[PDB]
Write an enzyme that holds these catalytic residues in place. Sequence first.
Site, PDB file in Angstrom:
ATOM      1  N   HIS A 119      -5.307  -0.506   2.701  1.00 11.76           N
ATOM      2  CA  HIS A 119      -4.729   0.568   1.406  1.00 11.76           C
ATOM      3  C   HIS A 119      -5.871   1.836   2.068  1.00 11.76           C
ATOM      4  O   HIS A 119      -4.835   2.464   1.526  1.00 11.76           O
ATOM      5  CB  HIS A 119      -4.380  -0.003   0.713  1.00 11.76           C
ATOM      6  CG  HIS A 119      -5.082   0.022  -0.713  1.00 11.76           C
ATOM      7  ND1 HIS A 119      -5.945   0.849  -1.236  1.00 11.76           N
ATOM      8  CD2 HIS A 119      -5.822  -1.335  -1.454  1.00 11.76           C
ATOM      9  CE1 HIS A 119      -6.550   0.663  -2.374  1.00 11.76           C
ATOM     10  NE2 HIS A 119      -6.973  -1.106  -2.923  1.00 11.76           N
TER      11      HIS A 119
ATOM     12  N   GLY B 136     -11.488   4.312  -8.000  1.00 14.12           N
ATOM     13  CA  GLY B 136     -12.572   4.279  -6.811  1.00 14.12           C
ATOM     14  C   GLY B 136     -13.447   2.870  -7.598  1.00 14.12           C
ATOM     15  O   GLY B 136     -14.099   2.640  -6.257  1.00 14.12           O
TER      16      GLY B 136
ATOM     17  N   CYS C 181     -12.008   0.042  -5.848  1.00 16.59           N
ATOM     18  CA  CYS C 181     -11.381  -0.643  -5.088  1.00 16.59           C
ATOM     19  C   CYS C 181     -11.960  -1.287  -3.654  1.00 16.59           C
ATOM     20  O   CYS C 181     -13.813  -0.320  -3.197  1.00 16.59           O
ATOM     21  CB  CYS C 181     -10.384   0.388  -4.300  1.00 16.59           C
ATOM     22  SG  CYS C 181      -8.588  -0.224  -5.326  1.00 16.59           S
TER      23      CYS C 181
HETATM   24  N1  LIG Z   1      -0.546  -1.603  -4.868  1.00 16.81           N
HETATM   25  C1  LIG Z   1      -1.957  -2.109  -4.675  1.00 16.81           C
HETATM   26  C2  LIG Z   1      -1.438  -0.632  -3.914  1.00 16.81           C
HETATM   27  C3  LIG Z   1      -3.672  -0.055  -3.904  1.00 16.81           C
HETATM   28  C4  LIG Z   1      -3.363   1.317  -3.068  1.00 16.81           C
HETATM   29  C5  LIG Z   1      -2.686   1.610  -1.810  1.00 16.81           C
HETATM   30  C6  LIG Z   1      -1.541   0.892  -1.984  1.00 16.81           C
HETATM   31  C7  LIG Z   1      -1.737  -0.154  -2.597  1.00 16.81           C
HETATM   32  C8  LIG Z   1      -0.789   1.395  -0.995  1.00 16.81           C
HETATM   33  C9  LIG Z   1      -1.444   2.733  -0.619  1.00 16.81           C
HETATM   34  O1  LIG Z   1      -2.449   2.686  -1.265  1.00 16.81           O
END
Ligand SMILES: NCc1ccc2c(c1)CCO2
Lengths: 305, 305
Positions: free
Chosen positions: A41, A143, A145
């Site tokens: 993502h 931050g 992730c």
């Molecule tokens: N649903 C968790 C998630 C978190 C960030 C992100 C996405 C999903 C897609 C675009 O960035």
Amino acid sequence: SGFRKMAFPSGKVEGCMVQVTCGTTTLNGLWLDDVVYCPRHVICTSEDMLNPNYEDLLIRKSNHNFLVQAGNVQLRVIGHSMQNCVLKLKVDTANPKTPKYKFVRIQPGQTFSVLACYNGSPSGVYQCAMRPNFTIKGSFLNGSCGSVGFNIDYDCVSFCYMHHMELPTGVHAGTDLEGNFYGPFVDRQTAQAAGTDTTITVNVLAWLYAAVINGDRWFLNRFTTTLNDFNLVAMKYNYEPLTQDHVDILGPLSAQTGIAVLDMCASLKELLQNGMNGRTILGSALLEDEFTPFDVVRQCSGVTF
Amino acid sequence: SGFRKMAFPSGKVEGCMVQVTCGTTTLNGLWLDDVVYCPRHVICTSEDMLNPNYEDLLIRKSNHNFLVQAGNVQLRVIGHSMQNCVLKLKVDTANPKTPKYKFVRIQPGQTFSVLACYNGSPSGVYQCAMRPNFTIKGSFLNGSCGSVGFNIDYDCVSFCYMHHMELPTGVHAGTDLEGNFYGPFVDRQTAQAAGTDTTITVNVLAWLYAAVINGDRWFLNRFTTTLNDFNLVAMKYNYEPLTQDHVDILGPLSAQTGIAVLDMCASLKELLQNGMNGRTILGSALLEDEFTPFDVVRQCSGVTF
Ligand SMILES: NCc1ccc2c(c1)CCO2
Ligand SMILES: [Cl-]
Ligand code: NA
């Protein structure tokens, strides 16, 4: 003596953490051999976030769109591909600090250490369990992730978790290192919720053995029980079923303390039915379920890495 | 979101841990630049434990009586000296992995990370606080002596604890890295006992501010208290006195949450009177006192929920 929630020493993993930036988004990568792993993502803006087509979003990107920093040194991306929900960035340099490692997928109830990181810099380490509902009760801010979870067996780091998102209840969801989510979650901003959680019975039993080993014995009693009888109690109190394989895994602790598992099940039955009557166990007024049988044995034995 | 007992990443300390052997005794040493620091009781024999004369024991030692093993490698000891209760072995190699570091003596209530080690190899990492009675509630087995406690605020390792012994109640005593014990303890096996311990009030208040930041308000009330009335109540529950220093220290968290410090004191007073009535705070059914105000700010979001 003493018994503490204990993480693995995190040095072998600290040497693998890098910063990955794509567009306005910065998060963490795991650098092993010549590949950096991070959540796919990372390639989304907040509008794509609602309903991303990841293969489409990735086609626009060139290698030079991925800025990867290892400390204060830039890494040159020379290839990129997706595996399930992780992005794999081929770089021009193998990580000289790559430890002996494997990718493993863990089972609910198993524990692991999380190295929480921000902008490629490790900030803290703590111990987590994969909940029965496939979330983890982590501690993560924006931050974080791409922070990873792991165990160490011998000298080999077994990577088991990469952090992807936070659910509305404040618990956390992520993937194994092959990008398969733990639990019925997807990487996009849509309506998602943790399912109803349960308590990890075999781990509570393991922790009661830890308490006995450390001199906390007030909850022991003369009674024993049967699996079928105990599992009716467990079901009533939203505890996971106890299986014969759980009983076997706790065998060592039963022999060491002289308390058979169904002997200890009788203790747990009475605790569940009556509470703790103002007392504590290993300093807790709650029944603790994030120590596995192996954790208890290891900490009460002194194994090193 | 989330709130965990979080240790610092241990890698910077892992690369300093060595094994020190004197006679039949092996424990851990800390290797920084060209000096190995370890507990001086490594030079005690089996009949020298109640009233050792360390000056007389040490003058009989030559450099080659000290075996120092760093991983697979023997280090050459080229000098030795005693400073208070620590032994400083000069060795012929500076540790290439020495971090930026300092030695800091901490005050009761301060927290730090412990890297438990056996035979020079790290076992695990966990968080401890210096109790008001100058002990720590650790997890230490035989062979853990010379394990250290530390913080890493920014990139500098502040070493604040070195483990020496376990007291009869199962809690632990040690020194700063200048070898001065915390508390009234001595490195002799004569009977000694920790003082009555108390709860670290300023830390409990910090943790309640953590709970508000993470979105929980159930324990607040409409009342306030004077500082002296708070202390008169809290000392009846074995809580440490709250000082104006502590009130000042909590200013930032008070400002972030909008809850005046003495109003939070009134909430704590009521929690001590009522218990939690089946509720939890940040996952705990007891009031937690091993998070400092500085810890809460480091771990929690800057935006209250
Ligand atoms: N649903 C968790 C998630 C978190 C960030 C992100 C996405 C999903 C897609 C675009 O960035
Ligand atoms: Cl301090
Ligand atoms: Na029993």
